[PDB]
Design a protein around this nucleic acid. Sequence first.
RNA 1: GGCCCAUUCGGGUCUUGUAAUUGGAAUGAGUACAAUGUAAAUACCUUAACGAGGAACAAUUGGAGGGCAAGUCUGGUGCCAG
Lengths: 14, 49, 283, 87, 347, 46, 103, 51, 360
Amino acid sequence: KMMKNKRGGVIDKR
Amino acid sequence: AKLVHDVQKKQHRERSQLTSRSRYGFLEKHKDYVKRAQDFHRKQSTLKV
Amino acid sequence: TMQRSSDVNERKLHVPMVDRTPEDDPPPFIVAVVGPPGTGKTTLIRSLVRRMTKSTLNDIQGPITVVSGKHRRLTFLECPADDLNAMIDIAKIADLVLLLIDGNFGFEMETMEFLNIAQHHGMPRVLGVATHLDLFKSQSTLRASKKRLKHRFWTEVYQGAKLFYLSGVINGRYPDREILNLSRFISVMKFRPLKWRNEHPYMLADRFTDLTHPELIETQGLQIDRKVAIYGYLHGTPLPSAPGTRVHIAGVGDFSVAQIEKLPDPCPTPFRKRLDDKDKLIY
Amino acid sequence: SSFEKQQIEIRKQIEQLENEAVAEKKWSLKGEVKAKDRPEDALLTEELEFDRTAKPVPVITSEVTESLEDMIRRRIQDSNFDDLQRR
Amino acid sequence: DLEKFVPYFDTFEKLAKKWKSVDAIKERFLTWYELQKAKISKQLEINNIEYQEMTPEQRQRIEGFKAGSYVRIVFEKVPMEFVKNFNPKFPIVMGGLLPTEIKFGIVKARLRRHRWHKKILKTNDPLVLSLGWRRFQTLPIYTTTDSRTRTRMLKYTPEHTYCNAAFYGPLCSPNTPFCGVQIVANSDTGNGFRIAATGIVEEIDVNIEIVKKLKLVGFPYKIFKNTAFIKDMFSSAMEVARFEGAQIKTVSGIRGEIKRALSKPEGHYRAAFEDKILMSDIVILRSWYPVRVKKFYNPVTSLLLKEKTEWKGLRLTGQIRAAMNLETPSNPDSAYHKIERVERHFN
Amino acid sequence: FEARQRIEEKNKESSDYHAKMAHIVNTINTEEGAEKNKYERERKLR
Amino acid sequence: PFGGSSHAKGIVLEKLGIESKQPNSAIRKCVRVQLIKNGKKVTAFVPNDGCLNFVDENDEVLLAGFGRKGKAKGDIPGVRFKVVKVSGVSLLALWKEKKEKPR
Amino acid sequence: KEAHKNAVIAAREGKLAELAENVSGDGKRAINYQILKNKGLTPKRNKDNRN
Amino acid sequence: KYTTFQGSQNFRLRIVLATLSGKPIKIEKIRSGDLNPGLKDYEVSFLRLIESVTNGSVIEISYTGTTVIYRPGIIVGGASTHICPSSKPVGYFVEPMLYLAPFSKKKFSILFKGITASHNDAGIEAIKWGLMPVMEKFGVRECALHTLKRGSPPLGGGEVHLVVDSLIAQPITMHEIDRPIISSITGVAYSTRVSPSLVNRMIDGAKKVLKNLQCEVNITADVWRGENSGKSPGWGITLVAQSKQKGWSYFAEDIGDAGSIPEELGEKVACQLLEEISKSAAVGRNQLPLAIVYMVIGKEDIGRLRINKEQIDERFIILLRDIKKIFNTEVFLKPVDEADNEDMIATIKGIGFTNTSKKI
RNA sequence: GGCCCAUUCGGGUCUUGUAAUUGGAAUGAGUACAAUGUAAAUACCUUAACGAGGAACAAUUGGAGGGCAAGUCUGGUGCCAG
Ligand SMILES: Nc1nc2c(ncn2[C@@H]2O[C@H](COP(=O)(O)OP(=O)(O)OP(=O)(O)O)[C@@H](O)[C@H]2O)c(=O)[nH]1
Ligand SMILES: [Mg+2]
């Protein structure tokens, strides 16, 4: 229900 | 009609029984269902009496 | 008559929206001559600039800006009558629309298409110009077609829109009395600010050149995207001097400003009273 | 030029989605799909959303047993019992 | 130096010796239409008087180039085809974008087939919107919002009213108007009217959530009073287990509910209905499958062609079918007939 | 599990929708029928 | 009713009842309009849900009296006006497509 | 099967060609009846009431 | 492509102004000379908060973790929550939400979970009584900071419900050509899990400083008892000078710690407030950054704000350099025609920014 | 079978209907040769020839009611109500 209406995203490559 | 177009109140036609399922004739819709159900209900009511 | 006074004082009100155009040196009003193919436009622009400048402009091309009053100067340009794309762009940037109508043939879907694109993009002041009044001997049927085209034009524009009947051509252009009071109608029209125009800095370019390098063209061999300078009066909001604002040039895409330097006025306005023949400039 | 490279890319994807647009629909993009109008076990991977008739029978976890039990503990130390009363 | 929100003070000893007294700051201690027009006129004259300042600050860098200031502008990376095919009959129309219009995403508009356009408009048929300065071909998808619950996908625009639509393009501000034209060439300008859709932009977003109804029809094969074994809308007991407890109904409005996956045939199940359904009925499970918008975007760029009409972009589905002679998909048991009821007589 | 979650989220949604629409219908009735009755109270004294 | 006149000009503030589920309900065809003459925010009807989507925001609307000829069913008595013109165009003509709304 | 397919394609193409050959004499897009008279969305009326 | 910044200073303001401007930024050299280099945990949680608030925005962090690529998106907001880490308080996260708050699709209702107050950060009543009225006169009407429970450092456990629900399109243009005559002075004195006498000792130190003016001093008190008190003891005091005729306010605040005196804290917050009143011209140095941020993101108009000589710091001018880097706007500091003070008037032409997310 | 009255039950009365086939007559708006008219011309008047079937040679405006779906939404004492 968090995932349903998002497109972006923090992309951690660390 | 007061604020209704003639192109707004059109006639939505009804569908038929499928061509595969054609030996169980006449796919019956809600008016045919209420003709079935209310007759069973009145015969059950006189049987209960 | 007090009920009449109230019921007319109700309609002097409008939505309060901002003007956002200056007081000191306003731009030239863009006039777009919109016609179906074959009737009017080029002869009409030639005739009006010959009235406003006393100087014929043979083979007009691109935007023409003349000074037509002590305060009002105005820019002509002609649509290519087959190009829906250029029709759309001048519908979005015009302030006055000289809508040519073949009086003999009737209305044409090119004009109705322009009226709908202008209506859905913030209708500018539309002045109808009915040409080809070489109908028949019957001045009766001329008056009948006059009334029919006038009412049908008033239905598509606001009621009260001026249809201007220009008769047949005498000697290459239109009769000078008719052109005189047509330009008199253009001389006062009270252009009101729209929304997209007053929220956007726009410009119709009147002069185009490529400031590229011919040695570099000869080097790389006709594959170089070349730097181009574009000249024109800028309308609308103040386009800022910062090099790097995005600009959509309608029909080539989005680019960005690399440098902008404003120039002295090439067709400036001069500093009961009339306007002088030394003062009717043309660019 | 850059316009011609862009035009080749645009005309390629115009061809790609135009035979997509005239191609046949998916099974899930038309109504009235039986068991045989769609792949075998097509719905197990698919996560369709639909209405359900009644609330299901509540599963009995440790949280609801402990909330039940201290309901009883409060009632039984406050001696609030809904018994019968002998006349 | 701004993660620290609380501003800088001195040390407490110096501050207490300073603020033993107070006296230095004791002097700090102790019609509607014409009204709106007067307010906005006062704002404009304030703007004018505080522009009356340093002249190159004003005329370059605090506002810059008001209106009617004749300018030249050097663009870079203008392609070869503009300068090659530059014909001055066609105008050169520049407009500066606002910060939203450099973006992309999904625009939700309400639009309408034009009252003079003859033919209806179909979802995923490309049309050329005129959205602000831009004109671009794109693929809209015309959505309804069935009594304000869903946003579900119609398959056509409605005949004489406004629907919604969603399309991937640049992101203009809300409440802007736009046109949309099917065709822009002159070889197929035909006889009829050209501009097809009109509307205003209601909302911008980066993701839309639109669904299309798929119904899973099944059939009954063993019917008792109030319960029936349903034959094939699933293929296996795992699928029925996935869909237990759902509400189904027949075409006669008799409601019901999936009770349990049957054991012996694989895709069969037991359902309990309101009353005794008949063998001639079709059970139905309305459920919602999501559909995506297509991120197809090409602008017109007709000032880059050698003729500047005859811009041919993506065609419509009818033109594709007539070009490669594909007959239109006709489901044969979808077309209507003239249903002639018998009389209904009971024992 | 998804049955119970979906049914409870649906009922919360519908019981908020009824509250919102009954609120705006009742404020439009109350604070504008006040003005309608005020105007007819100042039209019966004309 | 408005003060002096018969009709009155106004500014569309918001389409109230925009989430009401049942189409053509009296809450559905209900627009909050601030009058330009005297600044007050009143409420006016619209003919129907189908011509609700001609009025969007700050539209320079013209509004007149509603005039119930009797107690209807699903009414809200307590909205006295109706929209008659929008942006100088009569939206009954806009609803039957005789004209097109300019902007 | 291929005979029936090309038969219905020939019917569609004959219809589409007889639509798209219905142009005027000159390349002059004349306005038709509904853009001329501008009668949008009227009910069906009576020939009796016409006189 | 990306607007690149050097050093992890003004990090919140850079992420916020990139969100407002719609211009993609990079922040390079996040503390390169350090034994544990890169982003701190509160910074990463702030990027998570910006990801929750906005939509359509990608945030890229390098494999060494010492630079960021923030591509902003549409502010959409909605009802959410946020478990902030214990290294920073909730003032560090409810401070930037005031910038992005009235310019979203849906209305803001975010509640934060963590430490309420800290020494070098914004208190709850600091946020409320300083940085809400500047918004309420820059254009918003219905904004709220509900406190449901508060938490002293370190164990904390305090929950704070930011909810703004007046979505304006752009902030109005400020016109402040006056020094606001201070109408009164109020304050709050709070305590979590200590005796209810130290609060009175705080207000006694404060009123013995402020007693020598004939103006009206009034400090309310709140002890927090029970589950609404948090997991740690603490205490603090916030004094706010209030000018009612324009609605302005100037605040000062501090919390006490292990081994301090509430009389010291009352007199220290009082003298810090008096120094703010000295260096204050209609805005405090605390309320100044977002006030000028709203002035620049207003309409295409000239807005004027009278600011005095001492508010100009290196912090202020690095704010101005960074906002000019992000969307190219100069401020003109003109002087006033009186010389019994040093009040420049900052005039800004606001950019043409509008809340383009809202459904209409 | 149509119509008329009636709260009610019912009563009263009579060649009346049909996107039914079909027929030959009529002429106006129009299209228009003309003469006349008048300083010339428009205008009236007088006047040959072409001029009807969806007579598509295409009058509106307003109101009263229905009916339809494998459609949608809301309520709750099954199949109902809105
Ligand atoms: N008989 C007659 N001809 C006219 C009249 N007005 C314009 N024309 C003719 O129209 C012809 C086309 O000229 P324009 O209308 O100027 O052509 P345009 O405006 O450039 O438009 P395009 O033909 O598409 O290029 C010219 O040969 C003119 O003689 C008129 O009143 N009577
Ligand atoms: Mg020409």
